[PDB]
């Protein structure tokens, strides 16, 4: 079957940098003077948006920094000078050769300066405690780069194996990340200890930041 | 302007048949080409098939023995049927239109997630993450399958909202939190409610988040 190969599969660039993404078709996608090769932009959790149609036509409403080139088997998407909102996965798509296909996507990541996280800690709710489980949540808000270390401590005892992390995708305006770390304990285990603390190590912090609370529906 | 909207069950059992409908507004399905596209989690888009303005169809060869696309112009809808599903069919499913203005997939629905699993649906438990700038949120625990969506104040509060990717727990159920930052001075005066939608179980939960004591 026809295959579309994109290159590169991922790239990191700073705001204002030029971006070039290639799409190679294993056979010609041309017909009747057109190239049936289209480019899409897909942001996290959203449907793809058409950027360029028929190789070189800018779709209505798309910023002019986007352009497409190419013919036959070789195509290029160019972003002349990147904006923060260009963070996305980009796909090529051909619809003139059976079977229709997409490229495998190119993920564009945005590089920027260091931003320290703002840290918040949340105790478990009384309503959750009834159920026999306690979730303690630590929020790291609006930081860069993504790399961060979160260490839980309960009555000064370091925790391991009972926490899970989740990180947002880069923000469309300032390219930062936010992260949650969730510590899961038994109600019994939660009620036997007092001091709950989340310690955050990140490039933007000269020394680790700890947020804590003392238990109890006090 | 044309708008496309997917609907149908969010969970299907292995071996059974997946059905989805795309309801179209602002344009008649007697123009254009009406497609189904899918995307397994974290993977590339895959074109499945179309039904045209005339009722002609075109299906992906690898899906032919399992796929049907049908339509009802009185309802201005078209539908996907996919038989004998497996875990390979777990995906976000999109309907998309090709118009002859571009010969491209120029208009898309928002997508609907279908998970192929023998496990039962389970709606979420929602708990408060209680509060210059203050943070607050909702913990959305123990639901299946994905996804949940979260809004704040019925969509009126959007700035500073972060809803984290779901994590699969050891229980086989999913969890996530949604947080927002707001002025500390607004605490006690402004009400904050997280609106959790779990379409797979047709459950909605609206949790008010306020300060505690200690």
């Amino acid at each position: 079957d026809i295959v579309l190969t994109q290159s590169p599969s991922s790239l990191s660039a700073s705001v204002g940098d030029r971006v070039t993404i290639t799409c190679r078709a294993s056979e010609s996608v041309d017909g009747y003077g057109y190239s049936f090769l289209h480019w899409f932009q897909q942001k996290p959790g959203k449907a793809p948006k058409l950027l360029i149609y028929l190789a070189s036509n800018l779709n209505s409403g798309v910023p002019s920094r986007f352009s497409g080139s190419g013919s036959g088997t070789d195509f290029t998407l160019t972003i002349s000078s990147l904006q923060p909102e260009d963070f996305a996965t980009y796909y090529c798509q051909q619809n003139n050769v059976d079977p229709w296909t997409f490229g495998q996507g190119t993920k564009l990541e945005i590089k920027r300066t260091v931003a320290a996280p703002s840290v918040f800690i949340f105790p478990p709710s009384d309503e959750q405690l009834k159920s026999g489980t306690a979730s303690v949540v630590c929020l790291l808000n609006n930081f860069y780069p993504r790399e961060a270390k979160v260490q839980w401590k309960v009555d000064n005892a370091l925790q391991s194996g009972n926490s899970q992390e989740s990180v947002t995708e880069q923000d469309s305006k300032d390219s930062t990340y936010s992260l949650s770390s969730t510590l899961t304990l038994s109600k019994a285990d939660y009620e036997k200890h007092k001091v709950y603390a989340c310690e955050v190590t990140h490039q933007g912090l000269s020394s680790p930041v700890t947020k804590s609370f003392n238990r109890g529906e006090c | 302007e044309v708008q496309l909207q997917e609907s149908g069950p969010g969970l299907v059992k292995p071996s059974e048949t997946l059905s989805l409908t795309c309801t179209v507004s602002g344009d008649s399905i007697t123009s254009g080409y009406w497609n189904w596209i899918r995307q397994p989690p974290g993977r590339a888009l895959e074109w499945m098939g179309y039904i045209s303005y005339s009722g002609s169809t075109y299906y992906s060869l690898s899906l032919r023995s399992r796929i049907t696309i049908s339509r009802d112009t009185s309802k201005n809808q078209y539908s996907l049927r996919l038989s004998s599903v497996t875990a390979a069919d777990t995906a976000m499913y999109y309907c998309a239109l090709i118009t002859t203005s571009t010969y491209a997939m120029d208009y898309w629905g928002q997508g609907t997630t279908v998970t192929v699993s023998s496990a039962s649906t389970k709606g979420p438990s929602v708990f408060p993450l209680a509060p210059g700038t203050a943070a607050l949120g909702c913990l959305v625990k123990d639901y299946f399958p994905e996804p949940v969506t979260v809004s704040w104040n019925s969509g009126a509060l959007t700035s500073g909202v972060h809803t984290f990717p779901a994590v699969l727990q050891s229980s086989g159920l999913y969890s996530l939190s949604s947080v927002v930052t707001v002025p500390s001075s607004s605490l006690g005066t402004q009400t904050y409610i997280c609106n959790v939608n779990h379409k797979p179980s047709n459950t909605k939960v609206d949790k008010k988040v306020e300060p505690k004591s200690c």
């Binding site: 049936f36 619809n95 050769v97 | 002609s56 075109y58």
Partner: peptide
């Protein structure tokens, strides 16, 4: 306007 049949666009 071109017409699509079996994946390919043609005159008609």
């Amino acid at each position: 306007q071109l017409i699509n049949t079996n994946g390919s666009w043609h005159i008609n």
